[PDB]
Scaffold this motif. Structure first.
Motif, PDB file in Angstrom:
ATOM      1  N   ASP A 221       1.419   2.884  16.457  1.00 37.94           N
ATOM      2  CA  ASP A 221       0.565   2.143  15.538  1.00 37.94           C
ATOM      3  C   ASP A 221       0.537   0.640  15.777  1.00 37.94           C
ATOM      4  O   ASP A 221       0.134  -0.121  14.902  1.00 37.94           O
TER       5      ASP A 221
ATOM      6  N   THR B  32       1.683  -1.363  12.532  1.00 42.28           N
ATOM      7  CA  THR B  32       2.872  -1.108  11.725  1.00 42.28           C
ATOM      8  C   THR B  32       3.969  -0.473  12.557  1.00 42.28           C
ATOM      9  O   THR B  32       3.714   0.077  13.628  1.00 42.28           O
TER      10      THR B  32
ATOM     11  N   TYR C 215      13.811   3.483   4.839  1.00 43.95           N
ATOM     12  CA  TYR C 215      14.435   2.750   3.749  1.00 43.95           C
ATOM     13  C   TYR C 215      14.890   3.772   2.718  1.00 43.95           C
ATOM     14  O   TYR C 215      14.072   4.354   2.008  1.00 43.95           O
TER      15      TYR C 215
ATOM     16  N   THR D  46      10.479   6.794   5.143  1.00 47.64           N
ATOM     17  CA  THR D  46       9.875   5.926   6.146  1.00 47.64           C
ATOM     18  C   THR D  46       8.644   5.185   5.638  1.00 47.64           C
ATOM     19  O   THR D  46       7.724   5.788   5.084  1.00 47.64           O
ATOM     20  N   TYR D  47       8.640   3.870   5.835  1.00 44.90           N
ATOM     21  CA  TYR D  47       7.522   3.034   5.422  1.00 44.90           C
ATOM     22  C   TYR D  47       6.912   2.384   6.658  1.00 44.90           C
ATOM     23  O   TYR D  47       7.619   2.050   7.609  1.00 44.90           O
ATOM     24  N   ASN D  48       5.592   2.225   6.644  1.00 46.82           N
ATOM     25  CA  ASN D  48       4.887   1.624   7.768  1.00 46.82           C
ATOM     26  C   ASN D  48       4.690   0.144   7.500  1.00 46.82           C
ATOM     27  O   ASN D  48       3.681  -0.274   6.939  1.00 46.82           O
ATOM     28  N   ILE D  49       5.678  -0.643   7.909  1.00 46.13           N
ATOM     29  CA  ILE D  49       5.662  -2.082   7.712  1.00 46.13           C
ATOM     30  C   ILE D  49       4.669  -2.770   8.645  1.00 46.13           C
ATOM     31  O   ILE D  49       4.757  -2.646   9.868  1.00 46.13           O
ATOM     32  N   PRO D  50       3.704  -3.505   8.072  1.00 46.27           N
ATOM     33  CA  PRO D  50       2.690  -4.213   8.858  1.00 46.27           C
ATOM     34  C   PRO D  50       3.214  -5.503   9.484  1.00 46.27           C
ATOM     35  O   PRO D  50       3.717  -6.384   8.783  1.00 46.27           O
TER      36      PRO D  50
ATOM     37  N   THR E  29      -0.673  -6.222   3.109  1.00 48.30           N
ATOM     38  CA  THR E  29      -2.019  -5.778   2.789  1.00 48.30           C
ATOM     39  C   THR E  29      -2.246  -6.151   1.328  1.00 48.30           C
ATOM     40  O   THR E  29      -1.395  -6.794   0.710  1.00 48.30           O
TER      41      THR E  29
ATOM     42  N   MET F  79       0.575  -5.053  -1.318  1.00 50.61           N
ATOM     43  CA  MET F  79       1.961  -5.500  -1.230  1.00 50.61           C
ATOM     44  C   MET F  79       2.132  -7.016  -1.258  1.00 50.61           C
ATOM     45  O   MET F  79       1.159  -7.769  -1.182  1.00 50.61           O
TER      46      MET F  79
ATOM     47  N   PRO G 281      13.857  -4.760   3.085  1.00 46.64           N
ATOM     48  CA  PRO G 281      12.412  -4.729   3.337  1.00 46.64           C
ATOM     49  C   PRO G 281      11.790  -6.118   3.195  1.00 46.64           C
ATOM     50  O   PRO G 281      12.111  -6.856   2.264  1.00 46.64           O
TER      51      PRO G 281
ATOM     52  N   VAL H  45       8.599  -6.670   2.723  1.00 43.40           N
ATOM     53  CA  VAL H  45       7.455  -6.544   1.833  1.00 43.40           C
ATOM     54  C   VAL H  45       7.714  -5.430   0.830  1.00 43.40           C
ATOM     55  O   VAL H  45       8.461  -4.493   1.111  1.00 43.40           O
ATOM     56  N   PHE H  46       7.100  -5.553  -0.340  1.00 44.83           N
ATOM     57  CA  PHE H  46       7.236  -4.566  -1.405  1.00 44.83           C
ATOM     58  C   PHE H  46       5.875  -4.331  -2.041  1.00 44.83           C
ATOM     59  O   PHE H  46       5.027  -5.222  -2.056  1.00 44.83           O
ATOM     60  N   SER H  47       5.667  -3.124  -2.558  1.00 46.21           N
ATOM     61  CA  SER H  47       4.406  -2.783  -3.205  1.00 46.21           C
ATOM     62  C   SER H  47       4.296  -3.515  -4.535  1.00 46.21           C
ATOM     63  O   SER H  47       5.305  -3.827  -5.165  1.00 46.21           O
TER      64      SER H  47
ATOM     65  N   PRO I 220       4.133  -4.011  -8.232  1.00 38.42           N
ATOM     66  CA  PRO I 220       4.561  -3.222  -9.392  1.00 38.42           C
ATOM     67  C   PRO I 220       3.475  -3.105 -10.460  1.00 38.42           C
ATOM     68  O   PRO I 220       2.380  -3.669 -10.250  1.00 38.42           O
TER      69      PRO I 220
END
Lengths: 9, 141
Positions: free
Chosen positions: B33, B54, B59, B63-67, B88, B91, B135, B137-139, B141
């Protein structure tokens, strides 16, 4: 294939 | 579906062309990716190849797709790439030890970078471990 991030604490 | 021929084209102005192309191929082969693109950094005339997309970061058993975006300078691999986390709309950048307000990444691996000990595969391996622990970045809330 989509950007993702973990939820905050 | 890029090719080594096309990549060589993108780095015509680079000082170490084959070395940059070879490592780029290694990266995009392992990390599906991440895509190579010739774009302008800071100034329209400062064209450089960067790897954008990504990377898979586990974590807490997920698995998270970190940009990210890895800018390869025209001096790669003798100088380290300039790396950013690219959040994005869903986040936010987690400013901390290894990431500043602008999303620029700071890592010992980058700070002491030196050829041939340092390479992009090694760098990304470090990112996976470091970001898996904290991490960048975080989504929302």
């Amino acid at each position: 294939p989509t950007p993702s991030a973990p939820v905050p604490l | 579906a890029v090719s080594e021929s096309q990549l060589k084209k993108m780095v015509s102005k680079y000082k170490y062309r084959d070395l940059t192309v070879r490592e780029t191929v290694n990266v995009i082969t392992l990390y599906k990716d991440l895509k190579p693109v010739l774009d302008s950094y800071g100034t329209g005339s400062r064209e450089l190849m960067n790897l954008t997309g990504t990377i898979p970061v586990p974590y807490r058993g997920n698995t998270y797709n970190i940009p990210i975006c890895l800018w390869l300078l025209d001096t790669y691999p003798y100088n380290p790439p300039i790396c950013f986390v690219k959040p994005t709309s869903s986040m936010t950048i987690k400013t901390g030890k290894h990431v500043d307000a602008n999303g620029k990444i700071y890592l010992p691996y980058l700070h002491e970078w030196k050829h041939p000990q340092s390479d992009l595969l090694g760098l990304i391996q470090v990112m996976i471990v470091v970001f898996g622990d904290e991490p960048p970045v975080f989504s929302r809330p």
